């Protein structure tokens, strides 16, 4: 139709083309105009002219006030970090330096600094720069812990709520408990003055912390506390965060009936207020995919992560930790989905993208590698088995062994010898040594995984079930131990049918191994009845291939707030 451009957008291009001779006067423009000049600078590819003005804290504070065009600001910021300029660290250091000077100043200037710090730290935490958002929030806390007045406790407990989110995401779990204790101390100080702050956000962040350290027993209790603390006046972001963390804590204790309601309500709230193209909606999508992957709904989980990643590649840009987490989550889901098919082409591409981003933006001794690496170390294993060559198989298995050793070392340094993540790494190493034909080492690693996981989780937990399934596969197919394999296969089958019913996908990988076992030892009646059982399992599996997309399965207004919360609370009795 060829509509002529708006005089606003025509003068913006004329202002940008005259940028150098009118750079000082642009800073004296309305915030909506001033952001559009910088967005036009990014659009024209003039990042160095744009990056030299986003480095100043006060100039970046005005473009942070454009809450409407924040999806463009995140993309500009991610372009600047990929450009080479370290604006995230420069802005954090500038805020801390200009913050230490007005510690003794009046209440209005400190209030302005606190507000600027909240908006900047929220931006840097949303963008994924947790090591840089921590310094901003630390300086905000340092302002808050100066005058022991009324509003300062509220602002300090808000600072400590925001410090957990930038420490859980930065894998500083040792400082997370200290931050929660400090926040709880300030809440007690508030309670001594007859005023109770809303503790839903803090308890949700602590639930994230305890789920990250694999403390699911405590994580479930603290998410129960957070959901009890949810009120009607909570912001949408806070209740969404609490709901999705409570879903992640409920699905890991295998309360799938409650986790589905919590995460579907979280996804619905995220899609209503934020939209289908928002970072928080993408976070809810990642947690929904985590739910779907844990409940043997893997085909829908891949599509959910694919929807989650596509939001993060649009809102953010290239080398970002949020895009990296979306990649490493989608790589694992595509791995588990295409495990039987063997088409590890997209899974390897997504796992390689995750490591190619985390290594660039995080130190080599960081915990977030231990996820991405191990995901690749799974796929590289299954490509090694599928490859008919022996040289390529040996090279891939050696690379996967190096990646698994690195991830296990990171998990041991972070959590300890007796964590569930360390047990997962030991189980993966046992599978790899089974693939590497080191059968004694595989047996030792699987026994170590069983011993670590049995005490931490339940005796009949799902993780213990899959790990005894791996050990039974090792004993049956490789070590020819025909009785320990039988008992472990029976344990895995019993737990799978107890938890997921007859539709559990690991049931076929247990039945085929057990049929091979019985063919090796005899008792053809057992073989016949387990062929019948496998046929029935295949029937139920093809019947449950509805695979309706879970994006619209959350529907439009199935229930409301403080109804899913209330149902989850009453169901605890």
């Amino acid at each position: 139709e060829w509509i002529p451009e708006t005089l606003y957008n025509t003068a913006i291009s004329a202002v940008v083309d005259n940028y150098i001779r009118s750079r000082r006067d642009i800073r004296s423009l309305p915030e909506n105009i001033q952001f559009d000049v910088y967005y036009k600078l990014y659009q024209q590819g003039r990042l160095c002219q744009l990056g030299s003005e986003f480095c100043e804290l006060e100039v970046f504070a005005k473009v942070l006030r454009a809450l409407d065009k924040r999806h463009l600001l995140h993309h500009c910021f991610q372009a600047l970090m990929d450009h080479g300029v370290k604006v995230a660290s420069v802005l954090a250091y500038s805020f801390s330096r200009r913050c230490s000077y007005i510690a003794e100043s009046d209440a209005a200037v400190k209030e302005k600094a606190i507000q600027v710090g909240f908006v900047l730290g929220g931006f840097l935490s949303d963008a994924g720069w947790y090591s840089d958002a921590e310094k901003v929030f630390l300086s905000c806390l340092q302002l808050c812990t100066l005058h022991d007045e009324m509003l300062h406790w509220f602002r300090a407990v808000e600072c400590c709520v925001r410090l957990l989110h930038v420490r859980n995401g930065n894998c500083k779990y040792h400082l997370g408990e200290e931050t929660f204790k400090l926040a709880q101390t300030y809440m007690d100080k508030l309670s001594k003055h007859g005023q109770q702050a809303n503790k839903a956000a803090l308890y949700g962040e602590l639930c994230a912390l305890l789920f990250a350290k694999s403390h699911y027993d405590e994580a479930y209790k603290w998410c129960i506390e957070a959901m009890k603390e949810i009120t009607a006046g909570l912001p949408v972001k806070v209740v969404v965060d609490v709901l999705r963390q409570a879903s992640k804590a409920c699905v890991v204790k295998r309360e799938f009936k409650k986790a589905e309601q919590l995460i579907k309500h979280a996804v619905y709230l995220a899609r209503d207020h934020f939209g289908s193209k928002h970072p928080k909606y993408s976070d809810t999508l990642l947690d929904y995919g985590f739910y779907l992957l844990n409940v043997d709904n893997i085909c829908q989980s891949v599509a959910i992560y694919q929807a989650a990643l596509d939001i993060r590649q649009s809102v953010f840009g290239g080398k970002n930790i949020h895009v990296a987490t979306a990649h490493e989550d989608l790589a694992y889901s595509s791995y588990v989905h295409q495990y039987s098919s063997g088409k590890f082409d997209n899974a390897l591409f997504h796992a390689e993208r995750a490591i190619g981003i985390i290594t660039h933006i995080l130190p080599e001794d960081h915990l977030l590698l231990a996820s991405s690496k191990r995901v690749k170390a799974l796929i590289l294993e299954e490509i090694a088995i599928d490859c008919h060559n022996k040289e390529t198989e040996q090279r891939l298995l050696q690379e996967a062994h190096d990646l698994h050793l690195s991830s296990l070392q990171l998990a041991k340094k972070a959590f300890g010898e007796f964590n569930v993540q360390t047990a997962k790494h030991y189980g993966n190493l046992g599978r790899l040594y089974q693939s590497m034909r080191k059968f004694k080492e595989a047996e030792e690693m699987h026994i170590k995984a069983i011993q670590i996981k049995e005490q931490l989780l339940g005796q009949e937990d799902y993780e213990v079930a899959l790990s005894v399934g791996h050990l039974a596969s090792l004993y049956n197919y490789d070590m020819n131990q025909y009785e320990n394999a039988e008992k472990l296969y029976l344990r895995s089958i019993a737990i799978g049918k107890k938890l997921f019913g007859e539709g559990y996908s690991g049931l076929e990988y247990d039945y085929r191994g057990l049929i091979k076992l019985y063919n090796s030892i005899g008792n053809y009646e057992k073989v016949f009845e387990y062929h019948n059982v496998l046929s029935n399992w295949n029937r139920l599996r093809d019947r449950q291939y509805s695979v309706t997309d879970a994006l619209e399965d959350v529907s439009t207004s199935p229930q409301s707030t403080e109804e899913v919360v209330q149902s989850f609370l009453i169901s605890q009795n």
């Binding site: 791995y335 588990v336 495990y339 039987s340 799974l378 294993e381 997962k424 189980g427 993966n428 599978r431 089974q434 993780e463 899959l466 790990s467 399934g469 791996h470 596969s473 090792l474 197919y477 690991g506 990988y509 247990d510 191994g513």
Partner: peptide, 7 residues
């Protein structure tokens, strides 16, 4: 295949 998917 022999064993289940890697956890």
């Amino acid at each position: 295949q022999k064993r289940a998917s890697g956890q």
